Design an enzyme around this catalytic site. Sequence first.
Site, PDB file in Angstrom:
ATOM      1  N   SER A 113      49.495  44.359  33.338  1.00 28.05           N
ATOM      2  CA  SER A 113      50.828  44.744  33.070  1.00 28.05           C
ATOM      3  C   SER A 113      51.220  46.084  33.686  1.00 28.05           C
ATOM      4  O   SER A 113      52.211  46.215  34.199  1.00 28.05           O
ATOM      5  CB  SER A 113      50.701  44.837  31.479  1.00 28.05           C
ATOM      6  OG  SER A 113      50.984  43.327  31.078  1.00 28.05           O
ATOM      7  N   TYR A 149      53.042  46.145  36.716  1.00 28.14           N
ATOM      8  CA  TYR A 149      54.504  46.093  36.826  1.00 28.14           C
ATOM      9  C   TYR A 149      55.378  47.104  36.302  1.00 28.14           C
ATOM     10  O   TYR A 149      56.863  47.015  36.299  1.00 28.14           O
ATOM     11  CB  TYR A 149      54.721  44.747  35.894  1.00 28.14           C
ATOM     12  CG  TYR A 149      53.979  43.558  36.396  1.00 28.14           C
ATOM     13  CD1 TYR A 149      54.862  42.804  37.388  1.00 28.14           C
ATOM     14  CD2 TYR A 149      53.024  42.885  36.106  1.00 28.14           C
ATOM     15  CE1 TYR A 149      54.490  41.607  37.937  1.00 28.14           C
ATOM     16  CE2 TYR A 149      52.538  41.631  36.859  1.00 28.14           C
ATOM     17  CZ  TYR A 149      53.368  40.904  37.512  1.00 28.14           C
ATOM     18  OH  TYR A 149      52.991  39.944  38.203  1.00 28.14           O
ATOM     19  N   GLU A 160      47.595  35.142  31.287  1.00 29.81           N
ATOM     20  CA  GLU A 160      48.916  35.510  31.246  1.00 29.81           C
ATOM     21  C   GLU A 160      49.251  34.611  30.021  1.00 29.81           C
ATOM     22  O   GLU A 160      49.000  33.394  29.853  1.00 29.81           O
ATOM     23  CB  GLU A 160      49.241  34.610  32.476  1.00 29.81           C
ATOM     24  CG  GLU A 160      50.723  35.415  32.975  1.00 29.81           C
ATOM     25  CD  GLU A 160      50.726  34.928  34.325  1.00 29.81           C
ATOM     26  OE1 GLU A 160      51.873  34.299  34.830  1.00 29.81           O
ATOM     27  OE2 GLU A 160      50.065  35.214  35.293  1.00 29.81           O
TER      28      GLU A 160
HETATM   29  C1  6X2 Z   1      66.877  39.713  31.716  1.00 29.67           C
HETATM   30  C2  6X2 Z   1      65.685  39.959  32.441  1.00 29.67           C
HETATM   31  C3  6X2 Z   1      64.489  39.798  31.526  1.00 29.67           C
HETATM   32  N1  6X2 Z   1      63.327  40.052  32.091  1.00 29.67           N
HETATM   33  C4  6X2 Z   1      62.997  39.133  33.229  1.00 29.67           C
HETATM   34  C5  6X2 Z   1      61.212  38.798  33.279  1.00 29.67           C
HETATM   35  N2  6X2 Z   1      60.632  38.755  32.125  1.00 29.67           N
HETATM   36  C6  6X2 Z   1      59.286  38.213  32.098  1.00 29.67           C
HETATM   37  O1  6X2 Z   1      58.869  38.045  31.115  1.00 29.67           O
HETATM   38  C7  6X2 Z   1      58.637  38.098  33.175  1.00 29.67           C
HETATM   39  C8  6X2 Z   1      57.806  39.267  33.747  1.00 29.67           C
HETATM   40  C9  6X2 Z   1      57.055  39.037  34.719  1.00 29.67           C
HETATM   41  C10 6X2 Z   1      56.104  39.853  35.506  1.00 29.67           C
HETATM   42  N3  6X2 Z   1      55.344  40.744  34.423  1.00 29.67           N
HETATM   43  C11 6X2 Z   1      55.791  41.812  34.100  1.00 29.67           C
HETATM   44  O2  6X2 Z   1      56.812  42.258  34.481  1.00 29.67           O
HETATM   45  N4  6X2 Z   1      55.166  42.525  33.015  1.00 29.67           N
HETATM   46  C12 6X2 Z   1      53.932  42.164  32.575  1.00 29.67           C
HETATM   47  O3  6X2 Z   1      53.286  42.699  31.885  1.00 29.67           O
HETATM   48  C13 6X2 Z   1      53.523  41.052  32.727  1.00 29.67           C
HETATM   49  C14 6X2 Z   1      52.367  40.356  32.347  1.00 29.67           C
HETATM   50  C15 6X2 Z   1      51.977  39.126  32.867  1.00 29.67           C
HETATM   51  C16 6X2 Z   1      52.688  38.189  33.855  1.00 29.67           C
HETATM   52  C17 6X2 Z   1      53.496  38.799  34.355  1.00 29.67           C
HETATM   53  C18 6X2 Z   1      54.266  39.975  33.997  1.00 29.67           C
HETATM   54  C19 6X2 Z   1      57.212  37.737  35.595  1.00 29.67           C
HETATM   55  C20 6X2 Z   1      58.190  36.681  35.212  1.00 29.67           C
HETATM   56  C21 6X2 Z   1      58.922  37.051  33.979  1.00 29.67           C
HETATM   57  F1  6X2 Z   1      59.646  36.094  33.524  1.00 29.67           F
HETATM   58  C22 6X2 Z   1      61.579  38.917  30.844  1.00 29.67           C
HETATM   59  C23 6X2 Z   1      62.209  40.106  30.918  1.00 29.67           C
HETATM   60  C24 6X2 Z   1      61.271  41.188  30.990  1.00 29.67           C
END
Ligand code: 6X2
Length: 349
Positions: free
Chosen positions: A242, A245, A326
């Site tokens: 995490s 990111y 994940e």
């Molecule tokens: C309107 C945009 C809303 N965002 C889009 C991506 N969102 C995600 O949960 C998301 C986040 C990631 C990348 N990611 C991330 O960004 N943070 C994490 O802690 C993470 C952990 C495990 C796997 C991926 C992670 C990839 C795909 C996704 F859909 C929801 C939200 C934070």
Amino acid sequence: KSKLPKPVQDLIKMIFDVESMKKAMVEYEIDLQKMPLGKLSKRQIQAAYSILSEVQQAVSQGSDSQILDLSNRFYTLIPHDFGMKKPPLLNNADSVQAKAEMLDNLLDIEVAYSLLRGGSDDSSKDPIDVNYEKLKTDIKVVDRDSEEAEIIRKYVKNTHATTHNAYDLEVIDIFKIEREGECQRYKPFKQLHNRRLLWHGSRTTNFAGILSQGLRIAPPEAPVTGYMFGKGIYFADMVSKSANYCHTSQGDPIGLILLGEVALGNMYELKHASHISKLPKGKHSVKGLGKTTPDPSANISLDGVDVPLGTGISSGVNDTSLLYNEYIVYDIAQVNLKYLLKLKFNFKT
Ligand SMILES: CCCN1CCN(C(=O)c2cc(Cn3c(=O)[nH]c(=O)c4ccccc43)ccc2F)C[C@H]1C
């Protein structure tokens, strides 16, 4: 002059930082001359998602003549800083994912900026307090000697992966956070089995939107091929996963990361990408099976919620895309945000 604690005040400065929002825009190669921060809006972003969903279509079904037109129309909606250009062609699954990540970030920036330019102007009040009210979130500094702090620091200490050893992490501040009406939203899932305290890292320019709106799912217009396990909310059990990111760097080494209570329930377990639009009947979440997992014998409970803070061991899973676990939920009410940590990334490279 604000009576909030300093740590909380520095957090509010960080997340409502207008220059940081612009910095993030140029990181995604956007032209601020044509598409400045004030010009940003949801329907331009949703339209770009839809154009990116068409590029997705033509990539899946295979020509560089037609793709050019789709690619160009994407750049029309979201201007990029390429001068007299001929910009790069959007012709593969990677390019779709890269622009989908940008549009995710733009959505959270619009929200943050809109709070900033919405509402009232009062010179007698400290801007810090004013902006704190807009988050509709109670933030309290967790004490360093408390038991909840000791567990959280042990979660950070124990779950840094060997493959993410380019940095270590200092926990600078731990905040206990309570979004307005989220406990009420979570109520149906509160006694659900397999509840877990899991990490979510994001760039700091997203946190105003996250703390105001909660963690959201990517909208209908967004291409479901741009996300490994479809459009849900993604969490990890390893802090470094995490932490990556956050998109911190040597010239920007302070990041923010959440701890959320996630109602996983009956996990649909997967080894490889699977761009689902909905879970199979009776499953409450997806679990992307990692090669390494935190040690199940060392699971500790914090306020009745499991904290998987054991050291990384072999899961005994063979043909898997993922090095580390994940977790993905597809209903936003399955998340209750509990903590927010401010991290100092010590890069050794
Ligand atoms: C309107 C945009 C809303 N965002 C889009 C991506 N969102 C995600 O949960 C998301 C986040 C990631 C990348 N990611 C991330 O960004 N943070 C994490 O802690 C993470 C952990 C495990 C796997 C991926 C992670 C990839 C795909 C996704 F859909 C929801 C939200 C934070």
